[PDB]
Amino acid sequence: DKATIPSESPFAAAEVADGAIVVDIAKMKYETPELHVKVGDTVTWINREAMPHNVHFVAGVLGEAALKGPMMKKEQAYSLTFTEAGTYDYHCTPHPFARGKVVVE
């Protein structure tokens, strides 16, 4: 895979690592729809609203299978550690109008 998953479960926003690279989700959108990170960086999404959201990378993007993240409730977080340079598009499973990408460089 081109990502590893610290926690299969969402976790609390206060449990996000110090100095984490955070993408907030609010207004049914990713607030940073294009994020550039380095190989080895961990990205953390944090849902800032009540409606549940996830991140979903279709098959072939981060690995052979789709990486369908867990649904995050308000003030829950989810992290992925990116291990290979490339451009990785994602969307929210129930809300596929909401799209983003991580560019790993």
- Structure tokens, 102: 């991580």
Contact 45, 72 (CB under 8 A): yes
Main-chain dihedrals φ then ψ at residue 59, nearest 5 degrees? -55, 140
* Dist CA 74 CA 25 (whole Å): 9
Q: Toward Cu ion, which CB reaches closer, 46 or 92?
A: 92
Q: Toward Cu ion, which CB reaches closer, 54 or 79?
A: 54
* Dist CA 48 CA 77 (whole Å): 9
Cβ 93 to Cu ion shortest distance, Å: 7
Cβ 53 to Cu ion shortest distance, Å: 3
Tell me which DSSP letter residue 71 carries. P
Q: Toward Cu ion, which CB reaches closer, 1 or 31?
A: 31
Cβ 91 to Cu ion shortest distance, Å: 8
Q: Toward Cu ion, which CB reaches closer, 95 or 101?
A: 95
Cβ 66 to Cu ion shortest distance, Å: 16
- Chain residues that interact with Cu ion, rule: CB under 5 A: 53, 92, 95
